[PDB]
Coordinates of C-alpha atoms and ligand atoms in Angstrom, one line a residue:
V1426 CA 0.0 -5.4 10.7
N1427 CA -2.2 -2.8 9.1
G1428 CA -5.8 -2.8 10.3
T1429 CA -8.7 -3.2 7.9
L1430 CA -12.4 -2.9 8.7
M1431 CA -15.2 -4.6 6.9
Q1432 CA -18.8 -3.4 6.8
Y1433 CA -20.5 -6.8 7.0
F1434 CA -23.9 -6.2 5.3
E1435 CA -25.6 -4.5 2.4
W1436 CA -29.0 -2.9 2.0
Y1437 CA -30.4 -6.0 0.4
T1438 CA -28.9 -8.6 2.7
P1439 CA -31.8 -11.1 3.0
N1440 CA -34.4 -11.3 5.7
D1441 CA -33.7 -15.0 6.1
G1442 CA -32.4 -14.7 9.6
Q1443 CA -29.1 -16.3 8.6
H1444 CA -26.7 -13.3 8.5
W1445 CA -25.0 -14.0 11.8
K1446 CA -24.5 -17.6 10.7
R1447 CA -23.0 -16.3 7.4
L1448 CA -20.6 -14.1 9.4
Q1449 CA -19.6 -17.0 11.7
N1450 CA -18.9 -19.1 8.6
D1451 CA -16.9 -16.3 7.0
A1452 CA -14.7 -15.6 10.0
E1453 CA -11.8 -17.7 8.7
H1454 CA -12.0 -16.2 5.2
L1455 CA -12.1 -12.7 6.6
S1456 CA -9.1 -13.2 8.9
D1457 CA -7.2 -14.8 6.0
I1458 CA -7.7 -11.9 3.7
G1459 CA -6.6 -9.4 6.4
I1460 CA -9.8 -8.1 7.9
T1461 CA -9.1 -7.1 11.5
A1462 CA -12.4 -5.7 12.6
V1463 CA -16.0 -6.1 11.4
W1464 CA -18.8 -3.5 11.7
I1465 CA -22.1 -5.5 12.1
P1466 CA -25.5 -4.1 11.3
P1467 CA -27.7 -2.9 14.1
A1468 CA -28.3 -6.0 16.1
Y1469 CA -31.5 -5.1 18.0
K1470 CA -35.2 -5.5 17.2
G1471 CA -36.5 -3.0 14.7
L1472 CA -40.0 -1.9 14.0
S1473 CA -40.5 -5.1 12.1
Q1474 CA -38.5 -8.3 11.5
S1475 CA -37.5 -7.1 8.0
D1476 CA -36.2 -3.7 9.2
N1477 CA -32.5 -3.3 8.5
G1478 CA -32.0 -2.1 12.1
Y1479 CA -32.2 1.6 11.4
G1480 CA -35.8 1.8 12.7
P1481 CA -35.0 0.4 16.1
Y1482 CA -37.8 -0.5 18.5
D1483 CA -35.9 -2.1 21.4
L1484 CA -32.2 -1.7 22.0
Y1485 CA -32.3 -4.4 24.7
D1486 CA -33.7 -7.0 22.3
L1487 CA -30.9 -8.6 20.4
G1488 CA -33.1 -11.2 18.8
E1489 CA -34.2 -13.0 22.0
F1490 CA -37.6 -11.6 22.9
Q1491 CA -40.9 -12.2 21.0
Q1492 CA -41.6 -8.6 19.8
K1493 CA -43.0 -7.5 16.4
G1494 CA -44.1 -11.1 15.7
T1495 CA -40.5 -12.4 15.7
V1496 CA -37.8 -13.5 18.2
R1497 CA -34.9 -13.0 15.8
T1498 CA -34.0 -9.7 14.2
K1499 CA -33.6 -9.6 10.4
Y1500 CA -30.1 -11.0 11.0
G1501 CA -30.7 -13.8 13.4
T1502 CA -30.9 -14.6 17.1
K1503 CA -28.8 -13.3 19.9
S1504 CA -27.0 -16.6 20.4
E1505 CA -26.2 -16.8 16.7
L1506 CA -24.6 -13.3 16.9
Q1507 CA -22.7 -14.3 20.0
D1508 CA -21.4 -17.4 18.2
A1509 CA -20.4 -15.3 15.2
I1510 CA -18.5 -12.9 17.5
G1511 CA -16.8 -15.8 19.3
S1512 CA -15.6 -17.1 15.9
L1513 CA -14.3 -13.8 14.9
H1514 CA -12.5 -13.3 18.2
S1515 CA -11.0 -16.8 17.9
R1516 CA -9.4 -15.6 14.7
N1517 CA -8.2 -12.3 16.2
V1518 CA -10.9 -10.2 14.4
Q1519 CA -12.7 -7.5 16.4
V1520 CA -16.3 -6.6 16.3
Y1521 CA -17.8 -3.1 16.2
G1522 CA -21.5 -2.8 17.0
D1523 CA -23.8 -0.3 15.2
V1524 CA -25.4 2.1 17.6
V1525 CA -28.7 3.7 16.5
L1526 CA -29.6 6.3 19.1
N1527 CA -31.3 9.1 17.2
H1528 CA -34.8 7.8 17.3
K1529 CA -37.1 5.0 18.2
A1530 CA -39.6 3.4 15.8
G1531 CA -42.5 1.1 16.1
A1532 CA -44.2 2.4 19.3
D1533 CA -46.7 0.1 20.9
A1534 CA -49.3 2.8 21.0
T1535 CA -50.1 6.5 20.6
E1536 CA -50.2 9.1 23.3
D1537 CA -51.9 12.5 23.4
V1538 CA -49.3 15.2 23.0
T1539 CA -49.4 18.9 22.7
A1540 CA -47.4 19.9 19.7
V1541 CA -46.5 22.5 17.2
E1542 CA -45.5 22.1 13.5
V1543 CA -42.1 23.4 12.5
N1544 CA -40.7 24.4 9.2
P1545 CA -39.0 21.5 7.5
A1546 CA -36.3 23.8 6.2
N1547 CA -36.0 25.6 9.5
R1548 CA -37.0 23.5 12.5
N1549 CA -36.3 26.4 14.8
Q1550 CA -39.4 28.0 13.4
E1551 CA -42.8 27.0 14.8
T1552 CA -45.4 27.2 12.0
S1553 CA -48.6 26.3 13.8
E1554 CA -50.2 27.2 17.1
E1555 CA -50.2 24.4 19.6
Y1556 CA -52.7 21.6 19.1
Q1557 CA -53.2 18.0 20.3
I1558 CA -51.9 15.1 18.3
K1559 CA -51.8 11.4 18.7
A1560 CA -48.1 10.4 18.4
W1561 CA -46.5 7.0 18.4
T1562 CA -44.5 7.4 21.5
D1563 CA -45.4 4.7 24.0
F1564 CA -42.7 2.0 24.1
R1565 CA -43.5 -0.7 26.6
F1566 CA -41.6 -3.8 25.3
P1567 CA -44.3 -6.3 25.9
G1568 CA -42.1 -9.3 25.1
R1569 CA -39.1 -8.3 27.2
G1570 CA -40.8 -6.9 30.3
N1571 CA -38.2 -5.5 32.7
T1572 CA -35.4 -7.9 31.5
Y1573 CA -32.2 -6.0 31.6
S1574 CA -33.9 -2.6 32.0
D1575 CA -37.2 -1.5 33.4
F1576 CA -37.2 1.8 31.5
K1577 CA -40.4 2.5 29.5
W1578 CA -40.6 5.3 26.9
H1579 CA -43.3 8.0 26.7
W1580 CA -43.8 11.1 24.7
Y1581 CA -41.8 13.2 27.1
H1582 CA -38.6 11.3 26.4
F1583 CA -38.8 12.6 22.8
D1584 CA -38.5 16.0 21.2
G1585 CA -40.9 15.3 18.4
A1586 CA -42.2 13.0 15.7
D1587 CA -43.6 13.1 12.2
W1588 CA -47.0 11.7 12.3
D1589 CA -50.3 12.6 14.0
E1590 CA -52.6 9.6 14.0
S1591 CA -55.6 11.8 14.7
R1592 CA -55.6 13.8 11.5
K1593 CA -53.4 11.3 9.7
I1594 CA -50.9 13.8 8.5
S1595 CA -47.1 13.9 8.2
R1596 CA -45.4 17.0 9.5
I1597 CA -42.4 17.8 11.7
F1598 CA -44.1 17.9 15.1
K1599 CA -42.2 19.5 18.0
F1600 CA -43.5 18.5 21.4
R1601 CA -44.6 20.8 24.2
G1602 CA -43.6 19.9 27.7
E1603 CA -41.3 21.4 30.3
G1604 CA -38.7 23.5 28.5
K1605 CA -38.8 21.3 25.4
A1606 CA -36.5 22.2 22.6
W1607 CA -34.5 20.6 19.7
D1608 CA -31.2 19.3 21.0
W1609 CA -28.0 21.3 20.4
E1610 CA -25.4 20.9 19.2
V1611 CA -26.5 19.1 16.1
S1612 CA -26.0 19.8 12.4
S1613 CA -27.3 23.4 11.5
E1614 CA -28.7 22.1 8.2
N1615 CA -32.5 22.9 8.1
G1616 CA -31.7 25.3 11.0
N1617 CA -31.5 22.4 13.4
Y1618 CA -31.2 18.9 12.1
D1619 CA -32.0 17.1 15.4
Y1620 CA -35.2 15.8 13.8
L1621 CA -34.7 13.1 11.1
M1622 CA -37.4 10.4 11.3
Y1623 CA -39.6 8.5 13.6
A1624 CA -39.8 9.5 17.3
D1625 CA -36.8 11.8 18.0
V1626 CA -35.0 11.1 21.3
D1627 CA -34.7 14.1 23.6
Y1628 CA -31.0 14.1 24.8
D1629 CA -31.8 17.0 27.2
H1630 CA -33.9 14.6 29.4
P1631 CA -31.7 13.5 32.2
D1632 CA -33.3 10.1 32.6
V1633 CA -32.8 9.4 28.8
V1634 CA -29.2 10.4 29.0
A1635 CA -28.5 8.1 32.0
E1636 CA -30.5 5.3 30.5
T1637 CA -28.7 5.5 27.1
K1638 CA -25.3 5.3 28.8
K1639 CA -26.5 2.3 30.8
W1640 CA -27.6 0.6 27.6
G1641 CA -24.3 1.4 25.9
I1642 CA -22.4 -0.3 28.7
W1643 CA -24.8 -3.2 28.7
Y1644 CA -24.6 -3.7 24.9
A1645 CA -20.8 -3.7 25.0
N1646 CA -20.7 -6.2 27.8
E1647 CA -23.4 -8.4 26.4
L1648 CA -21.8 -8.9 23.1
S1649 CA -18.1 -8.4 24.1
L1650 CA -17.9 -5.6 21.6
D1651 CA -14.6 -4.1 20.7
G1652 CA -16.0 -0.8 19.5
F1653 CA -18.8 1.1 17.8
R1654 CA -20.2 2.6 14.7
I1655 CA -22.5 5.6 15.6
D1656 CA -25.5 6.0 13.3
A1657 CA -26.9 9.4 12.3
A1658 CA -24.4 11.3 14.4
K1659 CA -25.2 14.7 12.9
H1660 CA -28.7 14.4 14.3
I1661 CA -27.6 13.7 17.9
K1662 CA -26.4 16.1 20.5
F1663 CA -22.6 16.1 20.1
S1664 CA -21.7 16.4 23.7
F1665 CA -24.0 13.5 24.5
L1666 CA -22.2 11.3 21.9
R1667 CA -18.9 12.4 23.3
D1668 CA -19.9 11.5 26.9
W1669 CA -21.6 8.3 25.9
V1670 CA -18.5 6.9 24.2
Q1671 CA -16.4 8.0 27.3
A1672 CA -18.9 6.4 29.7
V1673 CA -18.6 3.1 27.9
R1674 CA -14.8 3.3 27.9
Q1675 CA -14.7 4.2 31.6
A1676 CA -16.9 1.2 32.5
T1677 CA -15.3 -1.4 30.3
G1678 CA -11.7 -0.1 30.6
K1679 CA -11.4 -1.0 26.9
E1680 CA -10.3 1.1 24.0
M1681 CA -13.7 0.9 22.3
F1682 CA -12.7 2.3 19.0
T1683 CA -15.6 4.4 17.7
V1684 CA -16.4 5.7 14.2
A1685 CA -19.3 8.1 13.8
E1686 CA -21.5 8.4 10.6
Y1687 CA -21.5 12.2 10.3
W1688 CA -23.1 12.4 6.8
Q1689 CA -22.0 15.6 5.3
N1690 CA -19.8 16.3 2.4
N1691 CA -18.0 19.0 4.3
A1692 CA -14.6 18.6 5.9
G1693 CA -15.0 21.7 8.0
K1694 CA -18.2 20.4 9.6
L1695 CA -16.6 17.0 10.1
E1696 CA -13.7 18.7 11.9
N1697 CA -16.2 20.6 14.1
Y1698 CA -17.8 17.3 15.1
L1699 CA -14.3 16.0 16.0
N1700 CA -13.6 19.0 18.1
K1701 CA -17.0 18.9 19.8
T1702 CA -16.3 15.2 20.7
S1703 CA -12.8 15.9 22.0
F1704 CA -11.2 13.8 19.2
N1705 CA -12.4 10.7 21.0
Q1706 CA -13.9 9.2 17.9
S1707 CA -13.3 8.8 14.2
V1708 CA -15.6 9.8 11.4
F1709 CA -16.3 8.3 8.0
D1710 CA -14.5 10.2 5.3
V1711 CA -17.6 11.3 3.4
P1712 CA -15.7 13.8 1.2
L1713 CA -13.3 11.1 0.0
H1714 CA -16.2 9.0 -1.0
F1715 CA -17.7 11.8 -3.0
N1716 CA -14.3 12.5 -4.7
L1717 CA -13.9 8.9 -5.6
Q1718 CA -17.4 8.8 -6.9
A1719 CA -16.9 12.0 -9.0
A1720 CA -13.7 10.5 -10.6
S1721 CA -15.7 7.3 -11.4
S1722 CA -18.4 9.2 -13.2
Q1723 CA -16.6 11.8 -15.3
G1724 CA -15.4 9.3 -17.9
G1725 CA -11.8 10.5 -17.6
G1726 CA -12.5 14.2 -17.1
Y1727 CA -11.9 14.4 -13.4
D1728 CA -8.6 15.9 -12.3
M1729 CA -7.0 13.0 -10.5
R1730 CA -4.5 15.3 -8.9
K1731 CA -7.3 16.5 -6.7
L1732 CA -8.5 13.2 -5.1
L1733 CA -7.4 14.2 -1.6
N1734 CA -8.9 17.7 -1.8
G1735 CA -11.2 18.5 1.1
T1736 CA -11.0 15.0 2.5
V1737 CA -10.9 14.2 6.2
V1738 CA -7.9 11.8 5.6
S1739 CA -5.9 14.7 4.3
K1740 CA -6.4 16.7 7.5
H1741 CA -7.2 14.2 10.3
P1742 CA -5.9 10.9 9.1
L1743 CA -5.9 9.4 12.6
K1744 CA -9.6 10.1 12.9
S1745 CA -10.7 9.0 9.5
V1746 CA -12.4 5.8 8.4
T1747 CA -12.0 5.7 4.6
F1748 CA -14.6 3.9 2.4
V1749 CA -15.6 3.4 -1.2
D1750 CA -19.4 2.7 -0.9
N1751 CA -21.9 1.7 1.8
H1752 CA -25.5 0.6 2.2
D1753 CA -26.7 4.1 1.8
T1754 CA -24.7 4.9 -1.3
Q1755 CA -25.3 1.6 -3.1
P1756 CA -27.8 1.6 -6.0
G1757 CA -31.4 2.5 -5.3
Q1758 CA -30.7 3.9 -1.8
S1759 CA -31.3 7.2 0.0
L1760 CA -27.8 8.6 -0.4
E1761 CA -27.3 6.8 -3.8
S1762 CA -23.9 7.8 -5.1
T1763 CA -22.2 4.6 -6.2
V1764 CA -18.6 4.5 -7.3
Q1765 CA -18.8 3.1 -10.9
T1766 CA -17.5 -0.5 -11.2
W1767 CA -14.6 0.2 -13.5
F1768 CA -13.2 2.6 -11.0
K1769 CA -14.0 0.5 -7.9
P1770 CA -10.6 -1.4 -7.8
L1771 CA -8.8 1.9 -8.2
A1772 CA -10.7 3.3 -5.3
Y1773 CA -9.9 0.2 -3.2
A1774 CA -6.2 0.6 -4.1
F1775 CA -6.5 4.2 -2.9
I1776 CA -8.0 3.4 0.5
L1777 CA -6.1 0.1 1.2
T1778 CA -2.5 0.7 0.1
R1779 CA -2.0 4.3 1.3
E1780 CA -0.6 4.9 4.8
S1781 CA -3.3 7.1 6.3
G1782 CA -6.8 6.4 7.3
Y1783 CA -8.5 3.2 8.6
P1784 CA -10.0 1.6 5.5
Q1785 CA -13.3 -0.1 5.3
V1786 CA -14.2 -2.7 2.8
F1787 CA -17.9 -2.9 1.9
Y1788 CA -19.7 -6.2 1.8
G1789 CA -21.7 -5.1 -1.2
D1790 CA -18.5 -4.6 -3.2
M1791 CA -17.0 -7.9 -2.2
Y1792 CA -20.0 -10.0 -2.7
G1793 CA -22.4 -7.9 -4.9
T1794 CA -25.6 -6.1 -4.1
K1795 CA -29.0 -7.9 -4.4
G1796 CA -31.3 -5.0 -5.2
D1797 CA -33.7 -4.9 -8.1
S1798 CA -32.1 -2.4 -10.5
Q1799 CA -30.3 -3.3 -13.7
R1800 CA -27.2 -1.6 -12.2
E1801 CA -26.4 -3.5 -9.0
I1802 CA -22.8 -3.7 -7.8
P1803 CA -21.2 -7.0 -9.0
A1804 CA -19.2 -9.2 -6.7
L1805 CA -15.7 -7.7 -7.0
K1806 CA -14.0 -9.9 -4.4
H1807 CA -11.6 -11.4 -7.0
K1808 CA -10.4 -7.8 -7.8
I1809 CA -10.4 -6.6 -4.1
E1810 CA -8.6 -9.6 -2.6
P1811 CA -5.3 -8.9 -4.4
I1812 CA -5.5 -5.3 -3.1
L1813 CA -6.2 -6.6 0.4
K1814 CA -3.1 -8.8 0.1
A1815 CA -1.2 -5.7 -1.0
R1816 CA -2.4 -4.1 2.2
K1817 CA -1.7 -7.0 4.5
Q1818 CA 1.7 -8.0 3.2
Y1819 CA 3.2 -5.1 1.4
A1820 CA 1.8 -1.7 2.4
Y1821 CA 4.4 -0.7 4.9
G1822 CA 7.0 1.9 5.3
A1823 CA 7.6 5.4 3.9
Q1824 CA 5.1 6.6 1.3
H1825 CA 5.8 8.8 -1.8
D1826 CA 2.9 10.4 -3.6
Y1827 CA 2.7 11.2 -7.3
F1828 CA -0.5 13.2 -7.8
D1829 CA 1.0 14.8 -10.8
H1830 CA -1.1 14.1 -13.8
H1831 CA -4.8 14.7 -14.6
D1832 CA -5.4 11.0 -15.3
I1833 CA -2.4 8.9 -14.1
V1834 CA -1.6 9.1 -10.4
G1835 CA 0.2 6.8 -8.0
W1836 CA 2.1 6.3 -4.8
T1837 CA 4.7 4.0 -3.4
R1838 CA 5.6 2.4 -0.1
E1839 CA 9.2 1.6 0.6
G1840 CA 8.5 -1.4 2.8
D1841 CA 9.7 -2.0 6.4
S1842 CA 12.7 -4.2 7.3
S1843 CA 10.4 -6.0 9.8
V1844 CA 7.9 -7.1 7.1
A1845 CA 9.8 -9.4 4.6
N1846 CA 9.5 -8.3 1.0
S1847 CA 7.2 -5.4 1.9
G1848 CA 7.0 -2.3 -0.4
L1849 CA 4.7 -1.4 -3.3
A1850 CA 4.2 0.9 -6.2
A1851 CA 0.6 1.7 -7.1
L1852 CA -0.8 3.4 -10.2
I1853 CA -4.4 4.3 -11.1
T1854 CA -5.8 6.2 -14.0
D1855 CA -9.3 7.5 -14.8
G1856 CA -8.4 7.7 -18.5
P1857 CA -5.8 6.3 -21.0
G1858 CA -3.0 4.2 -19.5
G1859 CA 0.7 5.1 -19.4
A1860 CA 3.9 5.1 -17.4
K1861 CA 5.3 6.8 -14.4
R1862 CA 8.7 6.7 -12.8
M1863 CA 8.4 6.4 -9.0
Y1864 CA 10.8 5.9 -6.1
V1865 CA 10.4 2.8 -4.0
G1866 CA 13.5 3.0 -1.8
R1867 CA 17.1 2.4 -2.6
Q1868 CA 17.0 -0.7 -0.4
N1869 CA 14.8 -2.3 -3.1
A1870 CA 17.3 -1.8 -5.8
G1871 CA 17.6 -4.5 -8.4
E1872 CA 14.4 -6.3 -7.4
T1873 CA 11.9 -7.7 -9.8
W1874 CA 8.4 -6.4 -9.0
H1875 CA 5.2 -7.5 -10.6
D1876 CA 1.6 -6.4 -10.7
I1877 CA -0.2 -8.2 -7.9
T1878 CA -3.6 -7.5 -9.5
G1879 CA -2.6 -9.3 -12.7
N1880 CA -3.9 -6.4 -14.8
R1881 CA -0.4 -6.3 -16.3
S1882 CA 1.9 -9.3 -16.8
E1883 CA 5.1 -7.4 -17.5
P1884 CA 7.4 -7.1 -14.5
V1885 CA 9.3 -4.0 -13.6
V1886 CA 12.9 -4.1 -12.4
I1887 CA 13.9 -1.4 -9.8
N1888 CA 17.1 0.3 -10.9
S1889 CA 20.2 0.8 -8.8
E1890 CA 18.8 4.1 -7.3
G1891 CA 15.5 2.7 -6.2
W1892 CA 13.4 3.9 -9.1
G1893 CA 11.1 1.9 -11.3
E1894 CA 9.2 2.8 -14.4
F1895 CA 5.7 1.6 -13.7
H1896 CA 2.9 1.0 -16.1
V1897 CA -0.9 1.1 -15.9
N1898 CA -3.6 0.1 -18.4
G1899 CA -6.4 2.6 -19.3
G1900 CA -9.1 2.9 -16.7
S1901 CA -7.2 0.5 -14.5
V1902 CA -5.0 -0.1 -11.5
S1903 CA -1.6 -1.9 -11.2
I1904 CA 0.1 -2.5 -7.8
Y1905 CA 3.7 -3.7 -8.1
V1906 CA 5.3 -5.7 -5.3
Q1907 CA 8.3 -8.1 -5.1
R1908 CA 7.9 -10.9 -7.5
Ligands
CA1338 CA1 -34.4 18.3 23.5
CA1339 CA1 -32.1 13.7 16.8
CA1340 CA1 -8.7 12.6 -15.6
CA1341 CA1 12.6 -5.4 -1.1
NA1342 NA1 -33.7 15.4 20.2

């Protein structure tokens, strides 16, 4: 059966501490609709209870130690998360944990550090003489003590930070120590993009490297994780991420599927990351997201024949996780670039019914986003579920592509003899509707097919040769399958 990932959170998921309970409760629904793996938000204690997890304070605190004035994380307690995972597993759904290793946030105290400022546009350039700062680098874990790990962090485990408590100024500070330098290889944007936010981990420090691998193995074993989602990969030494994934696989003996968030609309840079990590991990198909977003925003003017241009799925399908939107691209967020609602079902058809790539459904698209703009994403589950059913029950067999018109494009799947009544014919259009003759396999001759989305009520009969004349409404999607 085809695999389908679900990102199970959005930016505005509530800080009610009930998200793991929500997931546990949704396990049956997710398995029923065909989700086979869930990517959960960072599960460890952030700089505050309300942090989404991307400002992690203590990786070893999964919502079980009193730190930051709370036991639970934003999402709930450790036991609640373990219950959610147990429910998913009972329904043959896997769980991928989010791994936030770039930086640490929320230090317990400052320390005196010799530092230099660097150019924000070229971090390889020092722009001040050395001076003393007070940086937030002492991480002591007062509520955990030595439980699980007696490692304590200090300035020297980091390459830099962006705040000096002495002068109360925000700059990119690079620390001075013994052979300190920004890590390589990382994205070359801004000269060296090792530094992003908070206190940047130094992946040159041998103790840090060993400790982080130890943590990775611990985290997998503690939650019985089936794989990982790596946050902010372009800001972390690539050979380190390569080795870290391998270390966890060696210890567990498990596949440990991993997808990295390498946030760059550049297929060539994404391919470089794949090479530098020995093709041991997938990447999100950032270019495809941007293409889909472009099509959704040009009011019909986008050349739909070009949807696959420059995408990772077109070049390294087996290493691509395709997606429509995420918590960073949703309205009001840092990488805001939302696929417009009218086009969203078309985009889901594109990632869920095509043969290549590992598609990811976004919780915010299914259930809606709860931000404060007058342009939040509505709950589109009623439009995505039919497309998920198309994936689960019909998207099998040989695929034929029809990227042959500036608005109306489509593809078919012939079905597989081992999946009863499988096969489909999909059409999408960014402009006025119309028709397209497409081949669905001579073995489907004479069959009555119908649009599983309900957008069109008229059935299509496959002729004696395996060709059907399919129809799509304007700015819409139709996916035809056996009646
Ligand atoms: Ca370094
Ligand atoms: Ca970094
Ligand atoms: Ca067009
Ligand atoms: Ca058939
Ligand atoms: Na670093």
